[PDB]
Amino acid sequence: LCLSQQFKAQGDYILGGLFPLGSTEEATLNQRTQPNSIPCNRFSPLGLFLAMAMKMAVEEINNGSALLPGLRLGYDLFDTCSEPVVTMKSSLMFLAKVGSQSIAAYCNYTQYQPRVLAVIGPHSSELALITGKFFSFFLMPQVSYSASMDRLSDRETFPSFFRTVPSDRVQLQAVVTLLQNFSWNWVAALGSDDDYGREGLSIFSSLANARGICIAHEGLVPQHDTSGQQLGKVLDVLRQVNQSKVQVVVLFASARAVYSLFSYSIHHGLSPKVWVASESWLTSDLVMTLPNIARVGTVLGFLQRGALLPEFSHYVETHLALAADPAFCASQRCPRCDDIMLQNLSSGLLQNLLHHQIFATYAAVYSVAQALHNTLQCNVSHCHVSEHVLPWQLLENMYNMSFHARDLTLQFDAEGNVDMEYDLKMWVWQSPTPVLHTVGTFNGTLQLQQSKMYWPGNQVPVSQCSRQCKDGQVRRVKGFHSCCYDCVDCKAGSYRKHPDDFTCTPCNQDQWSPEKSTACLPRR
Amino acid sequence: SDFYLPGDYLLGGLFSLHANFLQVPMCKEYEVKVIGYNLMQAMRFAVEEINNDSSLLPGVLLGYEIVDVCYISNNVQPVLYFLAHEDNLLPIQEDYSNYSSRVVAVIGPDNSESVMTVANFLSLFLLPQITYSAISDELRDKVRFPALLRTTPSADHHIEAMVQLMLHFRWNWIIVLVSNDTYGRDNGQLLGERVARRGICIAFQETLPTLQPNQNMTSEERQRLVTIVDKLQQSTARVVVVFSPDLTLYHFFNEVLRQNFTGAVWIASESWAIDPVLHNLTELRHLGTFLGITIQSVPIPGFSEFRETCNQECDNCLNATLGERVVYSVYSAVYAVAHALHSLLGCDKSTCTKRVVYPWQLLEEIWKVNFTLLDHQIFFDPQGDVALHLEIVQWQWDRSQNPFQSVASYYPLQRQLKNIQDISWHTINNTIPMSMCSKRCQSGQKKKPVGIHVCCFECIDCLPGTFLNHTEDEYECQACPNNEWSYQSETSCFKRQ
Incomplete structure (x- = not known):
């Protein structure tokens, strides 16, 4: 197929795109020693589907006069290659003057005139951080469909970054509300060693401490399975989870880390626990393949509630068919992409669950288009055509808008995030295959269909700790922070000298003390 | 201004001299920070001293381009200014092995976040960057930061x-x-x-x-x-x-x-x-x-009498002045670049040749230096750190x-x-203050763990007919032989008749 040629289109204004259209095997990741080019080794269907979503959105906008009436909107899509060097090359190309092959080191944004109006940003949060920092200097407005790390919310370092997916903080606030509802006061917090997991643990540990949720253990699990230190570390994490007597574990970890942890947990025969999931695991590109999932004990977590695109699959198939026809072609950015036929992109891939990111890409295109529609002060059928909009001019309107996806209004807030609802999904194993069931919703408030909750047995799990002790007891602090206590009962022959952590004192010889008593007593 | 010196080869330097998104921020909005001025002067002293030393770069002048950075708030512009060559223009191309930038090396920022930000940009060109105070361990990844080195431990x-x-x-x-x-x-x-x-x-x-x-x-x-x-x-x-x-x-x-x-x-x-x-x-x-x-x-000998279109003119620093522990890192960074260049040009005493150098080769040579500076031996560990x-x-x-x-x-x-010396403590008799979770056992007492931490235990007496061998275990008692007995809390057995 002549498919990679479909990544560029002319127009009055042009949108840049960064997508995971290709990748490489691990053998390439050695230290760079000479500044040569990096080859396109491996194809990626996810990037192709997201690029198709952007193409579809722009095609719709060019058909329907509701936005940018009389204007033509173009696009220019590039592969990230999941590589910062290639991503930086593409980012630099976006910012160069049209027709030129170079960029000028001017001191401030007003002197530039880049060839694209906005950039629909990369898939991963790492490239989002990098390219957001770079783009902010030029005030190039960047909308990401996938990058959820909350560090990007900072308007000081990211004054021009937007996204059509909520940040991790909202998901973790939903999780904290879930723990608060079931009175799970005593929990263990785990995260992946990647920045995703470290920032997730930071956010959750900040949110839980404010609401009286006591974290028994806070730890990181590795991404890899290639050194004995990692086996020892997962064994130690299992030891920590066991010794703390926790029954509910929050696991804000990537799918590879969860796969490692769960495989080793099955290997070591860990007893059932409640596991509170995160989206990147819960959507399970990898984890749900494990043979013995049902022994892990219970899986539960929140998931996005965005709209759906019924026509996307037929659009993809239609344009692949068009790319297969030489009579159409008579009318690279990823050389491996041309080797792909329809059967390699079977509908079974699209019927899985990728809907969230595809819709987010569609909505990002629509957000940029609506912002431009506002900046040009468009009427019905007419626009302020007498001037050419620069990106920093679009940025002014992009903060103060509402835009329509398919039957869904969205708005960028003061920190560039959208507001969205969530479903609460519980894994059901009574079916012959693990399947997600909706058991509640979150929209800033948590609604639970508790009559539908699939707990094991006729009981709801519990994990709790004492916030204060009784008078006839001695305190003892526990937890990653000294937040809660376990209680000691003073046995006969000893007394609670202080109403405090101080251990019970042995009884005075000429006296005696019964159980739980606070003082020595004459034996007569 | 004194932010610039001409020469055959120029070093780039980034230091923080000063502490509505459409409004461009400017460093003059913030108070002077004297530490960064001291570090700038350290770089200037090192470069001019090298220019005086006839045995290091005979006939070759080191210039420099120093730019003030307000920590994280301005990190993109200086890098573009360093990278551009003809008419302040920077070409975009796939292979940069044949490209020459304005500066050959960068004495990089102070903050780890800014160091990473600049490194992600310079990695595209493999222009070497040496940094003086960013201790973050993440910088040791040379797959992620191939061109970055440090003159300080992590x-x-x-x-x-x-x-x-x-x-x-x-x-x-x-x-x-x-x-x-x-x-x-x-x-x-x-x-x-x-x-x-x-x-x-x-x-x-x-x-x-x-x-x-x-x-x-x-x-x-x-x-x-x-x-x-x-x-x-x-x-x-x-x-x-x-x-x-x-x-x-x-x-x-x-x-x-x-x-x-x-x-x-x-x-x-x-x-x-x-x-x-x-x-x-x-x-x-x-x-x-x-x-x-x-x-x-590390005291620099001659430094004291030497010291006493944007972001290159900050006059306020002098009267604000009128960094000893960090100065040596900047000094040794400049000297490392100077020795790497001296090697790269194939130079020798009084016999230099002014060959055109591309930064990615100077990086390869910077990895290779090993020399004594000011009575300390400075060379780079494979992970990029000098052992100070x-x-x-x-x-x-x-x-x-x-x-x-x-x-x-x-x-x-x-x-x-x-080389630990006499710390003077806050205690009543200058004794070492002790923090231990629980007191150590008497002989013949077993430990009983309490809670999660290993240091928490009760001390419990062994019962008669059992003994504890401290060379063998401490967490449970073990029984005496079939014709022996013990004095309750005791390390040893004795014979019954």
Whole structure:
């Protein structure tokens, strides 16, 4: 197929795109020693589907006069290659003057005139951080469909970054509300060693401490399975989870880390626990393949509630068919992409669950288009055509808008995030295959269909700790922070000298003390 | 201005001389920071001294282009300015092996975040960057940061020094206070990793609020500080490690003073170990012992009499002035670049040739230098760090002597703490203060663990007919032979008739 040629289109204004259209095997990741080019080794269907979503959105906008009436909107899509060097090359190309092959080191944004109006940003949060920092200097407005790390919310370092997916903080606030509802006061917090997991643990540990949720253990699990230190570390994490007597574990970890942890947990025969999931695991590109999932004990977590695109699959198939026809072609950015036929992109891939990111890409295109529609002060059928909009001019309107996806209004807030609802999904194993069931919703408030909750047995799990002790007891602090206590009962022959952590004192010889008593007593 | 010198080859330098999104921020909005001015002068002294040294670059002049950076708030523009060549234009192309930039090497930023930001840009060109104060361990990844080097140890060695200080004085039981920043969480996690391997238990870890010293404090933040100090007071641990920027700790220590807290050992990380502003608070001398882990000072001989279109003209620094421990890193960075260039040009005494150099080759040569500078041997470990000595300083308030007194020295290549001297403690008789979670057993007593931490145990007597062999186990008793017996809590058996 002549498919990679479909990544560029002319127009009055042009949108840049960064997508995971290709990748490489691990053998390439050695230290760079000479500044040569990096080859396109491996194809990626996810990037192709997201690029198709952007193409579809722009095609719709060019058909329907509701936005940018009389204007033509173009696009220019590039592969990230999941590589910062290639991503930086593409980012630099976006910012160069049209027709030129170079960029000028001017001191401030007003002197530039880049060839694209906005950039629909990369898939991963790492490239989002990098390219957001770079783009902010030029005030190039960047909308990401996938990058959820909350560090990007900072308007000081990211004054021009937007996204059509909520940040991790909202998901973790939903999780904290879930723990608060079931009175799970005593929990263990785990995260992946990647920045995703470290920032997730930071956010959750900040949110839980404010609401009286006591974290028994806070730890990181590795991404890899290639050194004995990692086996020892997962064994130690299992030891920590066991010794703390926790029954509910929050696991804000990537799918590879969860796969490692769960495989080793099955290997070591860990007893059932409640596991509170995160989206990147819960959507399970990898984890749900494990043979013995049902022994892990219970899986539960929140998931996005965005709209759906019924026509996307037929659009993809239609344009692949068009790319297969030489009579159409008579009318690279990823050389491996041309080797792909329809059967390699079977509908079974699209019927899985990728809907969230595809819709987010569609909505990002629509957000940029609506912002431009506002900046040009468009009427019905007419626009302020007498001037050419620069990106920093679009940025002014992009903060103060509402835009329509398919039957869904969205708005960028003061920190560039959208507001969205969530479903609460519980894994059901009574079916012959693990399947997600909706058991509640979150929209800033948590609604639970508790009559539908699939707990094991006729009981709801519990994990709790004492916030204060009784008078006839001695305190003892526990937890990653000294937040809660376990209680000691003073046995006969000893007394609670202080109403405090101080251990019970042995009884005075000429006296005696019964159980739980606070003082020595004459034996007569 | 003095921000620029012409020459055959130019070094780039980034230093922070100063402390509506459509409004472009400018450094002049912030007060002068004298440390960055000292570092700039260190670079200038090094480069001009090299130009005077006929044996290093005979007939070749090192120039420089220095640009002021307001920490993170301006990091893109200087890099583009450094990279551009003809008419301030920078070509975009796939292969840069044949391209020559304005500068051949960069003396990079101070903050780890800014170092990473600049590194991600320069990695595209493999233009070498040497940095002087960013201790973050993440910079050791040369897949991620191929062109980045350091003239200073990393957080690995600071935490090693802390842990070996704990081990030497037999402290089993510590508290960790961290900032909300990436710095505090990074160092807290690293310390948590290191202690578990060495037998030290962290009682609890707690996060300080992001306060600023001159500004007013809200009621909830005040209560947060109150809660943290309550947790300090309740605990039996009396060794406290604080990973926080100095400016934040004024309020925290004011609260600690207000609650009349006293009797702890405070272990300071390099970000506040030598702060005069905290030190001059007269009442800190009553809170306990303050020990700080920091890079060791190296005196530059001639430096004192030398010192005394945008972001290249800041006149205010002089009258603000009218960094000793960090200066040597900048000095040695300039000298490292100079030696790498001296090698790259194929140069020899009085016989240089001014060949055209592309930075990616100078990086390859910078990895290769090994020479003695100012009586210390500087070369780069494969992970990019120069092995400079660290030291441990105790704060002193007798103004007859220096505020910070060296009490120990740490060697990263030998990876051990050495030359420990007489710390003067807060105790009643200058005895070493001890923090242990539980008291050691009497002979013939078994340990019974309490809770999660290894250091927590009850001591319980062995019953008659059982004995405990301390060379063999300590957590359960073992029975006497079939014709032996024992005196209850006793290490040994005896024969029955």
